[PDB]
UniProtKB/Swiss-Prot annotation:
This is Transposon Tn7 transposition protein TnsE. It comes from the Bacteria. TnsABC + TnsD promote high-frequency insertion of Tn7 into a specific target site known as att-Tn7 whereas TnsABC + TnsE promote low-frequency insertion into many different sites. It comes from Escherichia coli.
Length: 161
């Protein structure tokens, strides 16, 4: 399914969407697009589904800040499976994003719900993507406004490499 299911799966991305709000208000970010897509079936394993039988999804967000663009990727782990980092993609070609994103979604499922980093390297270079760790205890016990802003800082910061 290539349909954008943003609003219907928004409950699963409560924290992540609060992060988007903070980037907009305190870190001069503009959101270019938000899309929430179903993960594809690959073989007979069932990681593309949640524990409850519903589709497991992935959210992509295009962001502009300080004259540069990046794309955030966030994998739905609402059923309590091991949380993935938030991917920050840079130098993303939007003219091929539709097809590339499709490869990425398949790579996530194929990698047993992990980022397909060899694919990311091929697509954007080793320096074209990085992971950002979620705030501690995200999913169990609410996260403070302080740590939410910290999360935002970690997303937009500059890397050594």
């Amino acid at each position: 399914d290539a349909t954008n299911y943003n609003s219907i799966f928004a409950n699963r991305f409560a924290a992540f969407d609060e992060l988007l709000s903070i980037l907009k208000t305190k870190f001069a970010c503009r959101v270019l697009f938000e899309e929430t897509l179903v993960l594809p079936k690959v073989g007979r394993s069932r990681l593309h589904l949640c524990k409850d039988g519903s589709p497991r999804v992935i959210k992509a967000v295009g962001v502009q800040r300080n004259g540069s663009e990046f794309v955030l990727l966030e994998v739905d782990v609402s059923d309590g499976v091991k949380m993935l980092s938030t991917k920050v993609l840079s130098g993303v070609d939007s003219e091929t994003w539709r097809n590339d994103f499709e490869k990425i979604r398949r790579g996530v499922v194929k990698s047993s719900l992990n980022w397909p980093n060899s694919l990311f390297d091929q697509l954007y270079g080793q320096d074209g993507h990085r992971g950002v760790n979620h705030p501690k205890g995200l999913g169990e016990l609410q996260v403070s406004r302080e740590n939410m802003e910290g999360w935002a800082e970690r997303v937009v910061r500059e890397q050594f490499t």
